[PDB]
């Protein structure tokens, strides 16, 4: 435990990420889904999001049809911290998907005002898992 912070008061980036996510208007998502060629940041964020939601997708067009829904952000804010999915996918994401320097608060933000809160959201879940893993049985100090 590097920090004395946990899911309790964990960096507000979690709640702040969900608040912004829902604060995204359909127009903000419409332009993103209309973007024929997304800049390094929009696509990457979309891919990571799908993995967290337990969904598999790696096609700009495939994802576009997802964000098109006006409730694409609602499901992102209703995400249940607890689930039977495979949360161990976080490491799989790190590999190179997260290595890319385009996966930052700067590049992502500049990618889309609606995508800015996304990068934070995906980065928020990863932060939570930190405490969840610590409290999780097995491998305890």
As a whole number of angstroms, the longest Cα–Cα distance in the chain is: 50
Tokens representing 18 are 């969900």
Give the count of alpha carbons within 13 A of 78, CB side only: 5
Give the residue extent of every domain in the chain.
12-135
Please tell me the CATH code under which domain 12-135 is placed.
1.20.920.60
Helix (H) or strand (E) holding 53: none
Instruction: Provide the experimental method for this PDB entry.
Output: NMR
Q: CB burial class (10 A; 0-12, 13-18, 19+) of residue 139? A: exposed
């Amino acid at each position: 435990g590097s920090h004395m912070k946990c899911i309790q008061d964990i960096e507000p980036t979690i709640l702040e990420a969900q608040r912004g996510v829902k604060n995204i208007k359909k127009q903000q998502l419409t332009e993103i889904r209309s973007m024929v060629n997304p800049p390094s940041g929009v696509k990457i964020v979309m891919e990571a999001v799908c993995a967290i939601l337990g969904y598999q997708f790696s096609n700009w067009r495939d994802i576009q049809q997802f964000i098109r829904k006006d409730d694409f952000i609602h499901n992102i804010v209703h995400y249940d911290t607890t689930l039977h999915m495979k949360p161990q996918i976080r490491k799989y994401m790190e590999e190179e998907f997260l290595s890319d320097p385009n996966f930052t608060y700067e590049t992502i933000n500049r990618a889309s005002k609606a995508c800015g809160p996304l990068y934070q959201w995906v980065n928020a879940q990863i932060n939570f898992s930190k405490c969840l893993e610590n409290v999780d049985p097995l491998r305890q100090e």
